Design a protein around this nucleic acid. Structure first.
Ligand SMILES: [K+]
Ligand SMILES: [K+]
Ligand SMILES: [K+]
Ligand SMILES: [K+]
Ligand SMILES: [K+]
Ligand SMILES: [K+]
Ligand SMILES: [K+]
Ligand SMILES: [Mg+2]
Ligand SMILES: [Mg+2]
Ligand SMILES: [Mg+2]
Ligand SMILES: [Mg+2]
Ligand SMILES: [Mg+2]
Ligand SMILES: [Mg+2]
Ligand SMILES: [Mg+2]
Ligand SMILES: [Mg+2]
Ligand SMILES: [Mg+2]
Ligand SMILES: [Mg+2]
Ligand SMILES: [Mg+2]
Ligand SMILES: [Mg+2]
Ligand SMILES: [Mg+2]
Ligand SMILES: [Mg+2]
Ligand SMILES: [Mg+2]
Ligand SMILES: [Mg+2]
Ligand SMILES: [Mg+2]
Ligand SMILES: [Mg+2]
Ligand SMILES: [Mg+2]
Ligand SMILES: [Mg+2]
Ligand SMILES: [Mg+2]
Ligand SMILES: [Mg+2]
Ligand SMILES: [Mg+2]
Ligand SMILES: [Mg+2]
Ligand SMILES: [Mg+2]
Ligand SMILES: [Mg+2]
Ligand SMILES: [Mg+2]
Ligand SMILES: [Mg+2]
Ligand SMILES: [Mg+2]
Ligand SMILES: [Mg+2]
Ligand SMILES: [Mg+2]
Ligand SMILES: [Mg+2]
Ligand SMILES: [Mg+2]
Ligand SMILES: [Mg+2]
Ligand SMILES: [Mg+2]
Ligand SMILES: [Mg+2]
Ligand SMILES: [Mg+2]
Ligand SMILES: [Mg+2]
Ligand SMILES: [Mg+2]
Ligand SMILES: [Mg+2]
Ligand SMILES: [Mg+2]
Ligand SMILES: [Mg+2]
Ligand SMILES: [Mg+2]
Ligand SMILES: [Mg+2]
Ligand SMILES: [Mg+2]
Ligand SMILES: [Mg+2]
Ligand SMILES: [Mg+2]
Ligand SMILES: [Mg+2]
Ligand SMILES: [Mg+2]
Ligand SMILES: [Mg+2]
Ligand SMILES: [Mg+2]
Ligand SMILES: [Mg+2]
Ligand SMILES: [Mg+2]
Ligand SMILES: [Mg+2]
Ligand SMILES: [Mg+2]
Ligand SMILES: [Mg+2]
Ligand SMILES: [Mg+2]
Ligand SMILES: [Mg+2]
Ligand SMILES: [Mg+2]
Ligand SMILES: [Mg+2]
Ligand SMILES: [Mg+2]
Ligand SMILES: [Mg+2]
Ligand SMILES: [Mg+2]
Ligand SMILES: [Mg+2]
Ligand SMILES: [Mg+2]
Ligand SMILES: [Mg+2]
Ligand SMILES: [Mg+2]
Ligand SMILES: [Mg+2]
Ligand SMILES: [Zn+2]
Lengths: 235, 208, 138, 150
RNA sequence: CCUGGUCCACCCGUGACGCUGAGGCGCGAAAGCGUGGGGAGCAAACCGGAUUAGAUACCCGGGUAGUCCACGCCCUAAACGAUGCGCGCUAGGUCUCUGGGUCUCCUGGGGGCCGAAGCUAACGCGUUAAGCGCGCCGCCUGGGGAGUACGGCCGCAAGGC
RNA sequence: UAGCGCCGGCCAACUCCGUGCCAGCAGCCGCGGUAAUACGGAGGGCGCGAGCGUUACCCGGAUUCACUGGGCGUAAAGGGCGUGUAGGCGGCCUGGGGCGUCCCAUGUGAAAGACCACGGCUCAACCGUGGGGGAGCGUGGGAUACGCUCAGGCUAGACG
């Protein structure tokens, strides 16, 4: 909530190509063939976006975090592992929202296998199943790591790159789900309901935005939490 | 033509109990109280889903066979109603109800509409004093439909009007049983008729 | 050159609104400006203003759109759903007062050019004069 | 609470080594006759499953119709593909005059008097979709003045 | 050597002098015709050899008109982007030809690819429109009969419209 | 006095027997070669009814000559290309005229028919009376936004 001047490394967009003309309103200028985001409109939209986040958080709503860009996976896997908003980390499975019932059946199988590895029934039905179900539970935890928390459809989604995660955006639009996204120059701003015009490639931009967002979430429900242990993920 | 022949077979074919004999459609002898399936060898067989034309044709035939009016006069009355200003269906019903034979039936002078047709055709009914023997005669609001003084001694009229003692008449009709007469007070509204017909189906049938 | 300047302005407005532009520049003319007056008066546009491009005068039409919609295709509803030129060069359309069309049973407008100025269907009908059926808008 | 009527049912065939294999498709309209309609096209190896699936899809795709005394507020004209639907409001006592498909759709919507015309392609599916988009493109005077507030 | 079109920069001059275009007129690959010339290679027709059930073909050896030139005819075509011309409007990215410029790039003209909105029955089109508009011309109205018959015009003829 | 057509789908109405690509039916799709709801007969049913069918012709549906209201990349359809005649169409500003355009007043628009109301034959068909109409054209007066014309001006099209 105090990220006015601390925006170090967010204004750097993508190159001259691979952009989207609809983003021109959020662009300041072009330095050395690289689009640079307008600093003013960034906080201009941040006001409205963080205000919507605070409103939805103090109401007890759930926000799905979607990150697959390989530069925000390790960040989302813990910023959502904070206050219980679920997340999608490895890859976004087609139908996680429009076919939510079938994915919830997969989650039922996940907790079923977790219960079988808690009961003494691990030894019966010998080692063949003890390896098959082991690998099955392994991949179910790999893909449904954060998704297992969604009991019903979420009240909003948070995307790190709406171009890389366009399928999730489309599925949210189909179900009238508000779409919060950290957009860059390579994305269509019209599809995003609450835009955050920043950088999606750098690690510091994602860490800053998501840390401040989860901090605002916990602040909307009281009990301000310590600074997130995501700085060590700079490496 | 008048379709003259079996009638309760129409009570059966239309699927709705019609009253074409007057009595015996109320008694447990209508053959609709005991045989609700359509006539013929293939009456008890499982019915197929009727086409839209089938539905509209059946409804129009129901409404037409209720009054015993031929197709010619029926279509003529419908076109006349569609020419006029107002709802085509309610106006068509008001026209059909304004026929002299139907008024005689509604006034309880006859037990059935065909018996009323015979009573009219044989000059047993007067309109405003003058004898009228036309079932297709259109009764205007205010016309006094009476029984001929020379016919007031007939056994059938005595029976029918002796049974009308205590019976109520339609909201658009008045009845004097001692004088054996009545008055067409107004045109009947759709809410005044309890006919088992959807008028819009007939309008759509003739819309083709 | 332009064969029909008025139809050119109408098509500029159509093509602009179809991509949700902010404003569009049309080569300026008194007739076009008098039509734009009716447009802005009827609420199809936020208004117009005279401007100057490198050497020549133009008219900036500031377009109008509805609220951003939900679900797929969040693009807002168009304020000008339809705008079509009627009296074109090569087939000019003149109507009497008893021949003025009621556009969309009321919800639209028809712009006429009459001897008493450029009016709308209801305006001309109240004035009792007819003329050239410029265009229909709804 | 909700009336459901099927528009058409057809049997399609795909070729496989050995012969043709059949798949049934069905159109279904659902309406409360209060101003809400819904169109659905279901496909299934058998007919009843296709009808049920079309009903579900139709209930999932709803359209709010602004009726004005049993009729439409303003005439519409919609091209879906090569099919064209032309709608025009009518005074009471007129009745619904339309082909089978638009008649069913409009009757389930609660319309009582309207005039229609199918043009170009008479395809029942495309005519149904054009009728749906026509009902979706309807605007009330309130909506019109709402868009022109400024 | 003679000569046509075209593009850019300067913003210099005229001051609506514009667009299209039924007729008309002219140009119009190849093949074909006339007169004269030329004739290496190729090569219809044709002469043979093979193949084949036969082989009036494909394959092989020859070979004339022709292909070439001058002049005059002929008016056809998958004469194709199977998309008439002109003007305006409507995201961009990339490759390229050619100018101009503060020469990372910008700007203008042309040739390609991918794609916004939109269009299309779909394939696909998408600032080189098949999008949105306007003007003018040409043409279509089920298939066969048939681009045949008759008539007319043109042509030496083949034949064309 | 009750008859005539139909009963595979379009299209309302189904069974039995005979026949066996025969005899036949058929507006279009089509039916018949052993078990035909399609032929022929029967029973039954559907539709009209002093009529019912058939044929012919006209409009309709047919947005299938598309003014309203269509098209031409691959479905029928862009002329092989150009130059250009007539013709069609014509950027911005001011003024005159008022030809197109528009308005008012007025004349004309016979009757019958059509529409509406009342009335006369017991109803109706039929008929009478009254009412309302209406484009177009003539005349008088008026308007000038647009199109037209004339006079002038401008430079964004075009040309140099
Ligand atoms: K007697
Ligand atoms: K369309
Ligand atoms: K020679
Ligand atoms: K250069
Ligand atoms: K025989
Ligand atoms: K038979
Ligand atoms: K051609
Ligand atoms: Mg009526
Ligand atoms: Mg009427
Ligand atoms: Mg006139
Ligand atoms: Mg609505
Ligand atoms: Mg089309
Ligand atoms: Mg067609
Ligand atoms: Mg100059
Ligand atoms: Mg000068
Ligand atoms: Mg030219
Ligand atoms: Mg020419
Ligand atoms: Mg040639
Ligand atoms: Mg040659
Ligand atoms: Mg020669
Ligand atoms: Mg020679
Ligand atoms: Mg040789
Ligand atoms: Mg050889
Ligand atoms: Mg040989
Ligand atoms: Mg051989
Ligand atoms: Mg041999
Ligand atoms: Mg030689
Ligand atoms: Mg020779
Ligand atoms: Mg080619
Ligand atoms: Mg061509
Ligand atoms: Mg073709
Ligand atoms: Mg082109
Ligand atoms: Mg270019
Ligand atoms: Mg492409
Ligand atoms: Mg698209
Ligand atoms: Mg595609
Ligand atoms: Mg173009
Ligand atoms: Mg032909
Ligand atoms: Mg023919
Ligand atoms: Mg031919
Ligand atoms: Mg030829
Ligand atoms: Mg020839
Ligand atoms: Mg000849
Ligand atoms: Mg000759
Ligand atoms: Mg020859
Ligand atoms: Mg020959
Ligand atoms: Mg049937
Ligand atoms: Mg027969
Ligand atoms: Mg015939
Ligand atoms: Mg036998
Ligand atoms: Mg048999
Ligand atoms: Mg039979
Ligand atoms: Mg019989
Ligand atoms: Mg006859
Ligand atoms: Mg015909
Ligand atoms: Mg026609
Ligand atoms: Mg028509
Ligand atoms: Mg024809
Ligand atoms: Mg046309
Ligand atoms: Mg066509
Ligand atoms: Mg060409
Ligand atoms: Mg001229
Ligand atoms: Mg000229
Ligand atoms: Mg002008
Ligand atoms: Mg002129
Ligand atoms: Mg003037
Ligand atoms: Mg005048
Ligand atoms: Mg007259
Ligand atoms: Mg008439
Ligand atoms: Mg009378
Ligand atoms: Mg008059
Ligand atoms: Mg005058
Ligand atoms: Mg004046
Ligand atoms: Mg001048
Ligand atoms: Mg120059
Ligand atoms: Zn009975």
């Amino acid at each position: 909530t105090v990220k006015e001047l601390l925006e170090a490394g967010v204004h750097f967009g993508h190159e001259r190509k691979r952009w989207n003309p609809k983003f021109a309103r959020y662009i300041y200028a072009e330095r050395n063939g690289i689009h640079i985001i307008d600093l003013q409109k960034t906080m201009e939209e941040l006001e409205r976006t963080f205000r919507f986040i605070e409103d939805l958080a103090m109401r007890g709503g759930t926000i799905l975090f979607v990150g697959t860009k390989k530069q925000a996976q390790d960040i989302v896997r813990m910023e959502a592992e904070r206050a219980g908003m679920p997340y999608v980390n490895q890859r976004w499975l087609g139908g996680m929202l429009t076919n939510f019932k079938t994915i919830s059946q997969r989650v039922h199988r996940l907790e079923e296998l977790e219960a079988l590895f808690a009961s003494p029934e691990i030894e019966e039905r010998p080692k063949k199943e003890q390896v098959r179900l082991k690998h099955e539970l392994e991949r179910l935890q790999k893909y449904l790591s954060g998704f297992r928390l969604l009991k019903r459809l979420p009240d909003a989604i948070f995307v790190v790159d709406p171009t890389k995660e366009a399928i999730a955006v489309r599925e949210a639009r189909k179900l009238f789900i508000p779409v919060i996204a950290l957009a860059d120059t390579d994305s269509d701003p019209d599809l995003v309901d609450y835009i955050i015009p920043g950088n999606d490639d750098a690690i510091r931009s994602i860490q800053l935005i998501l840390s401040r967002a989860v901090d605002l979430i916990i602040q909307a429900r009281g009990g301000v939490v310590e600074p997130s242990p995501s700085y060590a993920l700079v490496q | 033509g008048r379709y003259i022949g079996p009638v309760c077979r129409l009570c059966r074919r239309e699927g709705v109990k019609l009253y074409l004999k007057g009595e015996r459609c109320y008694s447990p002898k209508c053959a609709m109280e005991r045989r609700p399936y359509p006539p013929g060898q293939h009456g008890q067989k499982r019915a197929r889903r009727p086409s839209d034309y089938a539905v509209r044709l059946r409804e129009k035939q129901k409404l037409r066979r209720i009054y015993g009016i031929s197709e010619r006069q029926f279509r003529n009355l419908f076109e006349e109603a569609s020419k006029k200003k107002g709802v085509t269906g309610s106006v068509f019903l008001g026209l059909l109800e304004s026929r002299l034979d139907n008024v005689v039936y509604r006034l309880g002078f006859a037990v059935s509409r065909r018996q009323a047709r015979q009573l009219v055709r044989h000059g047993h009914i007067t309109v405003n004093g003058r004898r009228v023997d036309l079932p297709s005669y259109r009764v205007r609001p205010g016309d006094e439909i009476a029984v001929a003084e020379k016919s007031r001694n007939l056994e059938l009229i005595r029976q029918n009007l002796e049974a009308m003692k205590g019976r109520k008449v339609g909201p658009w009709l008045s009845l004097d049983v001692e004088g054996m007469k009545g008055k067409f007070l107004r045109l009947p509204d759709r809410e005044d008729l309890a006919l088992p017909v959807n008028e819009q189906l007939v309008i759509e049938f003739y819309s083709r | 050159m332009l064969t029909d300047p008025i139809a050119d302005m109408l098509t500029r407005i159509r093509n602009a609104t179809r991509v949700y532009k902010e404003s569009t520049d049309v080569p300026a003319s008194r007739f076009k400006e008098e039509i734009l007056r009716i447009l802005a008066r009827e609420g199809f546009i936020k208004g117009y203003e005279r401007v100057d491009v490198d050497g020549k005068p133009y008219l900036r039409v500031y377009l109008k759109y509805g609220p951003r919609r939900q679900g797929p295709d969040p693009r807002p509803e168009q304020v000008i759903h339809h705008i079509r030129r009627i009296s074109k060069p090569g087939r000019r359309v003149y109507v009497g007062v008893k021949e003025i069309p009621r556009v969309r049973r009321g919800l639209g407008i028809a712009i006429l050019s009459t001897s008493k100025g450029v009016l709308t269907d209801r305006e001309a009908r109240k004035l009792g004069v007819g003329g050239e059926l410029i265009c229909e808008v709804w | 609470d909700f009336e459901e009527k099927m528009i058409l049912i057809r049997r399609t065939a795909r070729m496989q080594a050995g012969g043709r294999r059949f798949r049934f498709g069905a159109l279904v309209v659902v309406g409360d006759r209060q101003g809400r309609v819904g169109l659905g096209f279901g496909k299934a190896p058998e007919v009843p499953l296709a009808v049920q699936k079309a009903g579900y899809y139709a209930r999932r795709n709803m359209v709010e119709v602004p009726l004005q005394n049993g009729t439409i507020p303003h005439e519409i004209e919609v091209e879906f593909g090569a099919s064209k639907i032309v709608l025009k409001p009518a005074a009471p006592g007129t009745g619904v005059i339309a082909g089978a498909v638009p008649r069913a759709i409009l009757e389930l919507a609660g319309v009582t008097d309207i005039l229609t015309k199918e043009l170009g392609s008479r395809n029942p599916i495309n005519i149904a979709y054009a009728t749906m988009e026509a009902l979706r493109q309807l605007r009330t005077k309130a909506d019109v003045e709402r868009l022109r507030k400024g």
